[PDB]
Amino acid sequence: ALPEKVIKAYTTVGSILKTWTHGKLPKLFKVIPSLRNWQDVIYVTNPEEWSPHVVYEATKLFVSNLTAKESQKFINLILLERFRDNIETSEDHSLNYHIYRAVKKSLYKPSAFFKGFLFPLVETGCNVREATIAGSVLAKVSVPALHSSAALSYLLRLPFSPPTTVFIKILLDKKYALPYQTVDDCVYYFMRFRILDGSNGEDATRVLPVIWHKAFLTFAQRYKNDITQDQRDFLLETVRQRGHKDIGPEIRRELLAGASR
Amino acid sequence: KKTKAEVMKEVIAKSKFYKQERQKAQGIMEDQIDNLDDNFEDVMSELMMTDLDKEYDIKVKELQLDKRAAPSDRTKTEEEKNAEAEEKKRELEQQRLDRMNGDALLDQVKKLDLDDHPKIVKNIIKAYQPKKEKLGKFTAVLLRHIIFLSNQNYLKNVQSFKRTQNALISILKSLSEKYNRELSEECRDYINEMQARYKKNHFDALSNGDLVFFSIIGIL
RNA sequence: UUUGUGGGUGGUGGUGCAU
Numbered sequence: 001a002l003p004e005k006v007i008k009a010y011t012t013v014g015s016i017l018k019t020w021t022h023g024k025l026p027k028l029f030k031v032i033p034s035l036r037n038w039q040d041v042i043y044v045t046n047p048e049e050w051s052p053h054v055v056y057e058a059t060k061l062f063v064s065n066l067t068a069k070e071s072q073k074f075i076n077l078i079l080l081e082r083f084r085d086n087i088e089t090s091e092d093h094s095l096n097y098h099i100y101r102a103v104k105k106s107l108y109k110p111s112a113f114f115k116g117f118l119f120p121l122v123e124t125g126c127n128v129r130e131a132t133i134a135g136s137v138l139a140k141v142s143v144p145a146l147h148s149s150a151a152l153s154y155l156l157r158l159p160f161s162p163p164t165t166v167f168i169k170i171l172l173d174k175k176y177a178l179p180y181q182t183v184d185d186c187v188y189y190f191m192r193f194r195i196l197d198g199s200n201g202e203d204a205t206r207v208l209p210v211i212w213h214k215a216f217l218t219f220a221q222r223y224k225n226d227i228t229q230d231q232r233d234f235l236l237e238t239v240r241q242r243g244h245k246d247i248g249p250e251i252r253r254e255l256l257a258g259a260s261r
Numbered sequence: 262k263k264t265k266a267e268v269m270k271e272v273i274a275k276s277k278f279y280k281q282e283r284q285k286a287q288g289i290m291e292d293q294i295d296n297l298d299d300n301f302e303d304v305m306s307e308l309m310m311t312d313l314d315k316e317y318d319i320k321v322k323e324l325q326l327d328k329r330a331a332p333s334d335r336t337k338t339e340e341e342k343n344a345e346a347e348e349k350k351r352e353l354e355q356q357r358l359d360r361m362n363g364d365a366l367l368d369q370v371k372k373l374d375l376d377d378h379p380k381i382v383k384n385i386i387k388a389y390q391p392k393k394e395k396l397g398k399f400t401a402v403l404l405r406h407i408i409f410l411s412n413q414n415y416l417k418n419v420q421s422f423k424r425t426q427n428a429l430i431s432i433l434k435s436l437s438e439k440y441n442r443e444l445s446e447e448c449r450d451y452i453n454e455m456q457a458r459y460k461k462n463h464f465d466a467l468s469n470g471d472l473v474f475f476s477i478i479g480i481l
Numbered sequence: 482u483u484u485g486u487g488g489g490u491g492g493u494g495g496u497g498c499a500u
Contacts, residue, residue: 002307009300012292019285026289028297035301040309072314094493110482111317119313136493144482145328146321153320154313179327182320225331261329334489393486 002044010044017045017054025057033065039073048081052098055082059102068111075106075116083117083130093129100137107141114151122155122163131163135170145176153182156189160203169215178223180261186219187231194238213247220251224258232260367402368409376410380425384432397443400436404447404477407433412470430477437481448478 013028032041047058055078062074079102087093106113118134126134142148152171155164168189178186192203220227220235227235232255239251370386371379383403390396407429415422437444451474458466 003303005296005299006303006307009292009296010304012288012296013300016285016289016292019281020289023282023285023289026293026297028293028300031297031301035305037304037307037309040307041300041304043309044304097493100493108482111314114317115314133493146324147317149324150317150320153323154316157316175332177324177328177330179323179329181323181327185320222331222333226329332488 002040006044010041011046014045014047014050017050021051021053025061029058029061033061038062038066038070042074042078047078048085052086052096055079055102056098059105063105063109063112068115071106071109071112072115075112076120079103079106079117080120080124083121084126087127087130087133093127095133100133103134103137104141107137107143110144110147113143114147114154118151118167119154122158122161122167125161126163128162128166131166135166138167138170138174142174148174148176149179149182152176152178153185156182156185160189160193160206162209165208165212165215169211169218172215172218172222175222178226180226180228183223183226183228183231187227187234190231190238191234193242194234195241208242210244210247213244217247217251217254220254220258224254225260227258227260229260232256232258364402364405364409367399367406371406377421377425380428383429387432387436396436397440400440401443401447403436404433404444407477408470408474411473412468415469433477433481444481448474 009028013026016026017029032038035041047055050058058078062071066074082099082102083095086095086099103117106117121130121134148171152168155168155171158164192201193208194204196204216239220239224232235255236252239248239255243249244251371382374382387396387399390399407426411426417425455466455471455474
């Protein structure tokens with residue numbers, strides 16, 4: 001029941017930034033980061049129907065100007081809707097690189113990417129295509145290592161999903177620092193994955209594909225110095241009961257011939 | 262008629278893009294001039310105001326507490342690295358054939374120590390330094406001091422003279438294959454200094470130090 | 482986030498063909 005001038009102005013600037021694909025931005029939209037009420041503003045603008053360059057410039061604006069929790073709510077709502085929108089509108093499931101750039105700015109802003117986009121995506125169950133897409137973004141662009149290893153620790157605490165293991169493969173190959181408490185988290189993930197020869201589990205017995213196998217290889221490859229020796233022979237038991245065909249003995253050689261702290 | 266048709270098509274294209282971009286320009290400017298300030302003022306008259314993030318903050322604190330790294334890319338096969346090196350040797354061969362056809366501070370520190378372990382003192386100084394310009398300037402005054410000590414004494418025997426000089430010479434090798442321009446201008450003006458000394462007196466400035474200067478440059 | 486010092490580079494690849 002808001003004022004009619006706000007209604008008309010924001011839906012008509014919504015149509016303006018629908019018909020936009022080239023050019024510049026309004027006085028209204030560049031004084032929107034001079035205010036606070038962005039949720040109400042952009043909810044009267046109705047954001048989810050604009051153009052790729054438009055979501056590009058909105059992300060450039062909010063990442064360049066605003067701060068953490070505003071970035072959280074903005075990136076969750078807007079980028080999740082636009083990301084799903086772009087992928088399930090493209091029939092071969094391709095993302096527009098300007099929306100990829102929006103994701104890149106979301107990474108670049110420090111506490112914007114994990115609070116807003118990636119973790120509600122893990123809750124809402126994206127497909128493996130979107131998983132590989134955000135993994136390639138995480139490969140090219142880099143947040144602070146603290147926040148990156150934070151994403152690692154929380155995704156290893158959160159349950160298994162194929163997006164979960166693809167993302168954790170992307171991080172373990174992204175090759176940041178792995179603290180010993182984080183390898184506590186990661187081998188806790190691994191002891192919820194292995195077989196408990198008394199209470200078995202679905203995550204402890206289910207089917208675990210080959211991208212997870214590459215993740216196991218890069219974990220025991222790079223990070224053999226932080227797995228403590230009980231975690232070492234626990235990885236021995238894990239890989240021997242759930243080994244592979246050509247990746248597994250490489251994991252075993254890396255695992256035994258690794259010394260640690 | 263086909264060519265004219267294609268051109269008519271392009272004309273239609275340019276006309277469409279110009280008119281539509283003009284329309285969007287008009288509308289955006291209109292709203293930006295009236296309804297912009299309207300919306301700003303009136304929405305300002307209005308208003309608009311955890312396991313994941315908790316784990317994020319906690320594991321960031323964890324990261325700060327305990328970062329840890331050890332880089333390791335994929336290992337290299339025997340024949341792979343060996344043939345790459347053999348080919349690099351071939352490239353070196355080709356480059357060689359194609360080329361064929363077409364101080365007191367250092368003194369004080371080291372002599373304050375002792376030569377017979379100043380080999381080690383210097384290697385350590387270099388180790389600390391290597392963990393650009395530091396390296397270059399020290400290498401230059403190192404070669405100077407090498408000349409100096411070799412012209413200062415020849416008392417020691419094959420056991421303690423040769424080993425010091427040859428380990429130093431290996432250091433010279435590796436520092437040469439890394440940095441060279443400092444060495445080059447050092448030895449250039451070194452030729453200047455020794456030719457001026459010859460011109461002062463022909464034989465009263467030549468010695469085993471300048472002879473081994475010839476030797477070390479000729480093997481470097 | 483950037484700086485003083487080392488360094489990763491081909492596929493948001495086309496692609497037949499058989500299931």
